[PDB]
Write a protein that binds this ligand. Structure first.
Ligand SMILES: C[C@H]1CCC[C@@H](CO)N1S(C)(=O)=O
Ligand SMILES: C[C@H]1CCC[C@@H](CO)N1S(C)(=O)=O
Ligand SMILES: [Zn+2]
Ligand SMILES: [Zn+2]
Length: 581
């Protein structure tokens, strides 16, 4: 408690000494409350006019139009302490998993140099505004790094002064850039060195690419065993226990020297004890604390969510296979059985999974897994939208499994080669492309963001009739040489290279599931879904609105060209059969 957080609390007390008050009508039950102080401020979703003008039929589709308009009673819940048998299973599994992940990887500190280059090309490193305007500025100024230095030496001393969370089924905890640097220095290696690559972690998919996920799920389907299970956790971040945080910290057991001490301090002072400032309208700032739940940088959050999910799913597999009988208590010989399972089959069982943070797909040895629920519930990883003790329903076909907000189709090219392609409901794809985040967008910047969506569609969703047409229209409407952009960033579509050349590189040349490397010479060689399958996944093909849009598309392209002005444009529409005369 207060010896670790008091210094952070004391320091904030004194910057708002005129405003401090121990409120008695505070709404916190599971958060420790400390005090309040005076503030007054709020970023809503803006429409991308380039994308909207080139997707007119969707202007009357509520599932698209409602996306652009407009639980914190889950952050304020409390998870129970797991039983001694559960805690044992987790500690044994966590110990074994960090050793496996560390066999081919060396923990190391990330550097000011590395941090600086990241900020100078717009990674979403959740920071705040004050003393300097942006992160881009603070980074070039040696004063900043003296602040960083002071805190750093405090962490080596085992104390914290300025690493405070700022709160904003989502919940994002920004810190000042200095705190983010110290987190990145100590734990950035997990992401920077790809500890959760599939080659390294066997279950992980970090860096693998949306064009690889479908092939990865099909490889899992090839294993002998039961149904494919894809259970979502209700509010994963809120169900991370102090025992989970202690198993995650064991990565420090693989470190040495300074790094070991800097990493241990991030875990102890910022993760296992948190200080948070929240805007309450009744508008004051609340300074609250708690020990458990996830509150870290988004990138460290991803890697530790992946780790703890891999751990939880191996234990659920152990329960299904009868490796232990009860979570109340492991016998001494059950401990040796669990250790022996891990050494004997652990790597095989990891390869039966695809795990992206809180999201998983598991193909267990058989369907006993479906009703193996005691360890999963006792760890606090309670399933979404199913009664606690009701057996999981699995998927019989890998093409129907949900993963990372997609499903995957098997699509045979006219030449017999096999593409496994990502897909989701087309209203969701069009609706997201019609939204921008933030202020002060020029027409040119808005156009370059539309071009980024269009090139993503050409590379990932070419098999959807409406998106290949709309992608060609947007790339025709935006000046040929203007560079695609984004404000929070594998994204092979972020290039001025010709999209057919990029398509060949991603789907043929670099695709390890494609034996025949014969390049495709035109977009007409590249297939679509069946027309009925395209409609099932939200296509407007067959509607009068869609027919008029497709037939008159050059009139829409010319409307956008007239707004942007007299620039160099390319006509990409004759890349499609129906516009090729
Ligand atoms: C362990 C080191 C060695 C150098 C390349 C690579 C191979 O796995 N890695 S790295 C940079 O990913 O940490
Ligand atoms: C595998 C891809 C596709 C989308 C999910 C996400 C999580 O793993 N990734 S990635 C390359 O951005 O790391
Ligand atoms: Zn600190
Ligand atoms: Zn689909």
């Amino acid at each position: 408690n207060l010896d670790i957080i008091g210094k952070r609390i004391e320091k904030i007390k004194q910057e708002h000494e005129t405003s401090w008050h121990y409120d008695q009508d505070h709404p916190y039950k599971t958060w420790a409350y400390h005090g309040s102080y005076e503030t007054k401020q709020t970023a809503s979703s803006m429409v991308n006019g380039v994308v909207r003008l080139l997707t007119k039929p969707w202007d009357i589709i509520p599932m698209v139009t409602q996306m652009a308009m407009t639980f914190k009673e889950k952050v304020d819940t409390r998870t129970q302490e797991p039983k001694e048998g559960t805690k044992k299973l987790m500690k044994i599994t966590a110990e074994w998993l960090w050793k496996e992940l560390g066999k081919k990887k060396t923990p190391r500190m990330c550097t000011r140099e590395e941090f600086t280059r990241k900020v100078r090309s717009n990674a979403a490193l959740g920071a705040i505004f004050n003393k300097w305007k942006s992160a881009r500025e603070a980074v070039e100024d040696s004063g900043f790094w003296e602040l960083v230095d002071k805190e750093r030496n405090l962490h080596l001393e085992g104390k914290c002064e300025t690493c405070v969370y700022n709160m904003m089924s989502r919940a994002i905890w920004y810190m000042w850039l200095g705190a983010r640097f110290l987190e990145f220095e100590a734990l950035g290696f997990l992401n920077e060195d790809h500890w959760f690559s599939r080659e390294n972690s066997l279950s992980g998919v970090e860096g693998e690419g949306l064009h690889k996920l479908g092939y990865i799920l099909r490889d899992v389907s090839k294993k002998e065993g039961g149904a494919m299970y894809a259970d979502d956790t209700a509010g994963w971040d809120t169900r991370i226990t102090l025992e989970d945080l202690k198993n995650e910290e064991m990565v420090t057991n693989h470190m040495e020297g300074e790094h070991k001490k800097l990493a241990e301090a991030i875990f102890k002072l910022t993760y296992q004890n948190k200080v948070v400032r929240v805007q309450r309208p009744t508008t004051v700032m609340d300074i609250i604390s708690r020990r458990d739940q996830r509150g870290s940088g988004q990138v460290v959050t991803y890697g530790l969510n992946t780790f703890t999910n891999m751990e939880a799913q191996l234990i659920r597999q152990m329960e299904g296979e009868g490796v232990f009988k009860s979570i109340q208590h492991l016998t001494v010989t059950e401990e040796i059985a669990v250790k022996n399972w891990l050494v004997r089959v652990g790597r095989e069982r990891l390869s039966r999974m695809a795990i992206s943070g809180d999201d998983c797909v598991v193909k267990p040895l058989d369907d006993r897994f479906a009703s193996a629920l005691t360890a999963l519930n006792d760890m606090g990883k309670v399933r979404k939208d199913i009664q606690q003790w009701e057996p999981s329903r699995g998927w019989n076909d890998w093409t129907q499994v949900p993963f990372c907000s997609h499903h995957f189709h098997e699509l045979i090219m006219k030449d017999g080669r096999v593409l496994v392609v990502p897909c989701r409901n087309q209203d969701e794809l069009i609706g997201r492309a019609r939204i921008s985040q933030g202020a002060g967008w020029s027409l040119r910047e808005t156009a370059c963001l539309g071009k980024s969506y269009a090139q993503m569609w050409s590379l990932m969703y070419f098999h959807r009739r409406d998106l290949r047409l709309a992608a060609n229209a947007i790339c025709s409407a935006v000046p040929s040489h203007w560079v695609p952009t984004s404000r929070t960033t594998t994204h092979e579509w972020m290039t001025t290279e010709d999209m057919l050349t990029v398509w060949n590189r991603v789907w043929i040349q670099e695709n390890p599931w494609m034996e025949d490397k014969t390049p495709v010479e035109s977009w007409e060689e590249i297939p679509y879904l069946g027309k009925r399958e395209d409609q099932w996944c939200g296509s407007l093909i067959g509607l009068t609105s869609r027919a008029t849009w497709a037939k008159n598309i050059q009139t829409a392209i010319n409307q956008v060209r007239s707004l942007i002005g007299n620039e160099e444009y390319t006509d990409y529409m004759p890349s499609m059969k129906r516009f090729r005369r």
